[PDB]
Amino acid sequence: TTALVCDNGSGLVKAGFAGDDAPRAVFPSIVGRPRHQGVMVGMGQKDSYVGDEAQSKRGILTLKYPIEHGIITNWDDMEKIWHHTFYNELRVAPEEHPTLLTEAPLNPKANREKMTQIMFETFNVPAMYVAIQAVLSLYASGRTTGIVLDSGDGVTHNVPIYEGYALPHAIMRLDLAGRDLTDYLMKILTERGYSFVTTAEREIVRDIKEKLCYVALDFENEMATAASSSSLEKSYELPDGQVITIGNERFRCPETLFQPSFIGMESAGIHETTYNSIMKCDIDIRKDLYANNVMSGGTTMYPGIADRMQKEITALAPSTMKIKIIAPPERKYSVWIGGSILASLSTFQQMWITKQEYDEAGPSIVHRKCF
Amino acid sequence: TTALVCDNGSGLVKAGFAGDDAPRAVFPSIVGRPRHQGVMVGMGQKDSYVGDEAQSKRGILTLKYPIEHGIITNWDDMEKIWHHTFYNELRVAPEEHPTLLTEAPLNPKANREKMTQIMFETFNVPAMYVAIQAVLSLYASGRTTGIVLDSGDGVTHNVPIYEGYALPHAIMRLDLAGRDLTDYLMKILTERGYSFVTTAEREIVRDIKEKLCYVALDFENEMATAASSSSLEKSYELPDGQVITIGNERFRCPETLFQPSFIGMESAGIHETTYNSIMKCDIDIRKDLYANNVMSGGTTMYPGIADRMQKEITALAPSTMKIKIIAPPERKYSVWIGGSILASLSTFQQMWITKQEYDEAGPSIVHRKCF
Amino acid sequence: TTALVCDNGSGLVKAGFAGDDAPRAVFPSIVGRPRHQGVMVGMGQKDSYVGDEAQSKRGILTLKYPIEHGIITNWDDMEKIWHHTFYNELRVAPEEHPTLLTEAPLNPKANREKMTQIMFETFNVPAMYVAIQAVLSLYASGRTTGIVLDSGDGVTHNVPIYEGYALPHAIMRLDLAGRDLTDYLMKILTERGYSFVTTAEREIVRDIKEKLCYVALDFENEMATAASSSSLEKSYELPDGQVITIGNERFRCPETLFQPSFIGMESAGIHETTYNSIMKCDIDIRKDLYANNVMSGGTTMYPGIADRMQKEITALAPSTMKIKIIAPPERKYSVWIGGSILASLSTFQQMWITKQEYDEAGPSIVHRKCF
Amino acid sequence: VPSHRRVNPPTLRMKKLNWQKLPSNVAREHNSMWASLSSPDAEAVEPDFSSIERLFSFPAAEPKEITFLDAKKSLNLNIFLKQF
Amino acid sequence: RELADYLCEDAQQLSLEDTFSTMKAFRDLFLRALKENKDRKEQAAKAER
Amino acid sequence: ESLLTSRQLPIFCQLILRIGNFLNYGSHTGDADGFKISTLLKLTETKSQQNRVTLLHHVLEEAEKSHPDLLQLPRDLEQPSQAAGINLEIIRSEASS
Ligand SMILES: Nc1ncnc2c1ncn2[C@@H]1O[C@H](COP(=O)(O)OP(=O)(O)O)[C@@H](O)[C@H]1O
Ligand SMILES: Nc1ncnc2c1ncn2[C@@H]1O[C@H](COP(=O)(O)OP(=O)(O)O)[C@@H](O)[C@H]1O
Ligand SMILES: Nc1ncnc2c1ncn2[C@@H]1O[C@H](COP(=O)(O)OP(=O)(O)O)[C@@H](O)[C@H]1O
Ligand SMILES: [Mg+2]
Ligand SMILES: [Mg+2]
């Protein structure tokens, strides 16, 4: 039997089979409900729109994200998200297919309890596993050792692994990723005059961030260049036909990853998190973490981020030793890809959480069988 | 039939073939067990790394030394060490070749008992012999008479031999050698702030001690030179790229050999041990033991030990008689070279301990056959 | 005049006069700097809050601990701490009062050098002394022999003393105490959903650890009780009015002292540290050290630690000798109190470090006068 | 009247519920709850011992759709085909 | 004192706090047992359907 | 007062005493006139053969059919649950001061 991989992240659900190259069902994770008064009768007015239908019909909908910083808050919405990604997107029966879900580290345990219980009692499987996303990104990178910085839509987490051994005391979690970048871009696009307040306008600001934004190599020189001349300004077309043109917000928005004090957070940037995660490890492996900085997630898809983080770590690391960022061209879907190699691995077949073991052990095996 | 010579010293196992001048397999005697959590499934995650693989992957391992002060504490680890030095390094069948062994004097007898039992019930050879290391060092020195100070990693022992006769009552043992120097060097490196606490970092301090430390010719004058000027200070490169600098700690570490009160021992130094070992002998034979101070062991590989030894003995001995230190450049492997000389000798063939002798006599013939 | 005692520990500064029974000025050692934007002009907005004012105003501050594992990392912050504890809290003139300071053993020497230079050139005393905390705790206990475990907020150190003689080779330092317990309690409180990421929330987690946590007499039975029933769960009130409830984390947090592998350290527990400190001494005095296990420090304020310490040492020691744990009810301030014993003795008055000795010998007399 | 002690012995071996048993003389106090239970006029619930003995005892010693492809490419073809 | 004689505990060793905590845990286990029984019966009915 | 004047709590205590007198026959713990308060916490230890149903779940399953008044038992124990965690000594010392 083929296996399923379903990276159920904060922003985009990426689901597909095992052994495949690309994730077949990539769609954002939103539940849309109408907020106006429907006067027409007939022709199928649904009370809830999930997936691409909520994206297409977003001008009459309130969109709710069921996952916030990796922790599922609304569970009926996440039930509908799983129902849509099994029955409507992949068009599969979950009762005859194993399933590998992804999870950020340092998650509350009752979240994992409810994932296990709903996944085993609503969409009851033969087997299911819950994995760490950084381990799957290292599976996609094709190497055994390395430090992985994953940055999805809610969680940026750093996990270092050497020769198959993850160090749990060196794992760090930062609740700052693309949703907070989107909210900060909604805050700073109000300076130029463009007002965005609704949940539908968050998708337009997200499309602006995906299409135009880039990571600056040097922040102060880029601010001076944008203040001096309008060569860095770029234009975008809204769905109502209005044409916007933005300047420094192309590179002020991804700078929150390197400077978390923009949105009021006390914690340091992702480069200091990576350096402290390396420095928390034992000494003899640290060189092998400098040459294998694996990046993943859609937040690291800006076309200026690898040279910038190489510059920051090379400033932070001792100078007698090479820094090398491993940034693949397909690092958006690398969690799904490494889930596809791990689902197709022959040795992984003994590590499934079967239904019989769940019935014997209650919903408590997922603390002791998983990481 | 070529014999095997396997010096199973405290520091590094040195094994090879008889008749040769250099040992084929020199590798440290450690057992490395992983301590963190393995997450990457497959690719042969061994539960115990032995020898060179433990040294090359020590950043995820707890390293255990099977010998402590000349006595084998852990026996399963020594079974793994003997399996590694027979099957993996030399790649020879033990059941068709004899294998010579080395041992420190004033050892508890059960170590020799279990050595006999394991080498004739697990690594069953056609013949073997257990020898005193100082007798082998004098055989490699090419002279019949002399006193040998052998200082390995656990035992510093003095044995005098005159005309092939070793006096038993003058043999002295001191439990102060290179591991205690490494322990004291980890203690005194905390003054400069470099906290080396792990078992992996003990190998780093051992590499510091091998590369940089030296025996001072005078101790108080080198305090005067080190405290006055920073001319003796030397920098070292750690595996993470950090660079340390040590000053007087280059020569404070071996002076524990000449002053055992640094680590809180009531016993006198190795020069006083040598002088009392000579003085316990007869008055006729002291003249040849003055002129033939043969030295061996890796702890005698500091580049200042022979002149300090000559100075302290010439201060201790009466001045009318000649003091000479015999320090060959290959004295690190001189136990192995003496074992290769003694194994290839024609007069040694009746002195073997056979399988038939072990079967008729139990594991108790090693006390009456060996010295 | 009357001397001062100023225990400048990692967590709490305890200052007071000599000849007194209780420390007059106890306040935590933090420096708080504002991180948000001040909008209301005037009314004396200080750029750095030190002590209780930083505690009361911590919701708008970044709090920095100047001492890390007994080593002063930031010296301007500790100058501010000394200025606050002399001029504001105690309200004394430091140039006309001797001041006794406390220090952990096996410390880097340059820390002691800079304390000597700053306290003779910025806070210029007539005289001072730098004392080991365990000797002050034993002098507080009113006895001459015993082994002292002292566990503050950065350093847990074991020192055995027999008839006023301290054995220096048996002194053992472990960098695991209450700040590491607070960080581990941050790491395990994320399981229940309570996210504590800021430096202000560290004080809340520390108050949870002070008020609710306890040392289990048997860890596995207490885990079985916590897994079975929620009887030992207890509730705490946050300053925003939210009520949390914690279960097994009451005793998993101080178990890191007995099991250092929770936070990734390879070292053994404090009971094994105490037992190895006893066994490194002479054989004739150990019977005196078994019966006089003195404990001190705030990390021994958990109300289950003495019975667990007696149980673990009684399991470790031979059964024919008496195990007794000296745990007075005022052993939190005992490092102060014995200092107030030692500063008021007539035989201590020649052991002061006068200004003339510092001027003639540089800041190097502290290595030769203090132990 | 010892109504609580009048229980039949069981046929099968039962899993032991561990507890801290009170002394009998402590349980016979005047203000005791067990003394109020020992009065026969109190309300007693008869348990169904049959189900307790049943459960908590110890245990003893076809070609419909034939295909020449593999399932992965066939389901990828189904996703490709059913969107038309 | 009346509850010490009522629950047949030692009067000089009874604390009211661990008594009320044991009752709190017993009520929490009671509600969790009722919730697990309801979920088990609902899932058994759904499986039979 | 709720613990001293509870009706359903002695009913449940006699029920668990009869079940234990069935269940711990032939041992030293059997034939008991009473037990401590901590017996109710350990009720989830006694599992079924399928490791799904504990003894507490089966007692409330039997009590749903035969004697439903035991389901009134959290009403009597709500005030001990609210009273739990209250330290009498600190509030009495504050009142005395
Ligand atoms: N090409 C791109 N350039 C910049 N940012 C992107 C790009 N594609 C996606 N993103 C951002 O990264 C996120 C996608 O990361 P992903 O790991 O798929 O999130 P999730 O899995 O939580 O939905 C989106 O929320 C989006 O804001
Ligand atoms: N070049 C060197 N300089 C200084 N010390 C050395 C050198 N080589 C080895 N040593 C020390 O000597 C020890 C090796 O001595 P050896 O005779 O092999 O002891 P053993 O055989 O008893 O283990 C090592 O532990 C090392 O610390
Ligand atoms: N009542 C208590 N219960 C548990 N832990 C406590 C208690 N009081 C203090 N502590 C812990 O002990 C530490 C105080 O020990 P102390 O030696 O005074 O620290 P320092 O002197 O370094 O500030 C604090 O950091 C706190 O975490
Ligand atoms: Mg993701
Ligand atoms: Mg040797």
Ligand SMILES: [Mg+2]
């Ligand atoms: Mg202290």
